[PDB]
Design a binder for this molecule. Sequence first.
Ligand SMILES: CCOC(=O)CNC(=O)NCc1cccc(-c2ccncc2N)c1
Ligand SMILES: [K+]
Length: 164
Amino acid sequence: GNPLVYLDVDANGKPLGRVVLELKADVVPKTAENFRALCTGEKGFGYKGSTFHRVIPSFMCQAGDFTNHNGTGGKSIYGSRFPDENFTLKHVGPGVLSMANAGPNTNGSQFFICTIKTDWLDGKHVVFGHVIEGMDVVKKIESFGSKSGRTSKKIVITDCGQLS
Ligand SMILES: CCOC(=O)CNC(=O)NCc1cccc(-c2ccncc2N)c1
Ligand SMILES: [K+]
């Protein structure tokens, strides 16, 4: 079935705990597979050692720019970008896992975890999973954000991978 993956996150080198995510390979197989492989690092690149670079309280926590660490970089396992797979899954509340983008058909590696319902993003960002465990960890990350998106501590995915 659907991959279960994890992200172990610290703040200025101090551990905050584990976020566990289900990836909806049953609905968005290509988008799910991208994220799964970037978690395991099996392609020779991925999320381990990269940051949450944009975190906005009462909105979302954004990560996945593992090349430039600021929203301008990242890439997929397929190439620099890939199409919007479908918009079947909606931004229904906190804990939704969704692709960041720069417009239609610009998915790379950047993603976000929602800390509120973000339904104004429906049909524009490809939702591909949700938090199974560690919404308290997400809330810790959210606490180091700001209204600008800048983080007040360096928030690092110290490890990541696939549980099943
Ligand atoms: C709530 C989520 O909000 C957003 O998605 C706001 N947008 C955003 O953060 N865009 C940066 C970005 C996001 C994703 C991919 C790129 C990209 C960069 C350079 N070359 C190719 C690319 N595919 C850039
Ligand atoms: K706002």
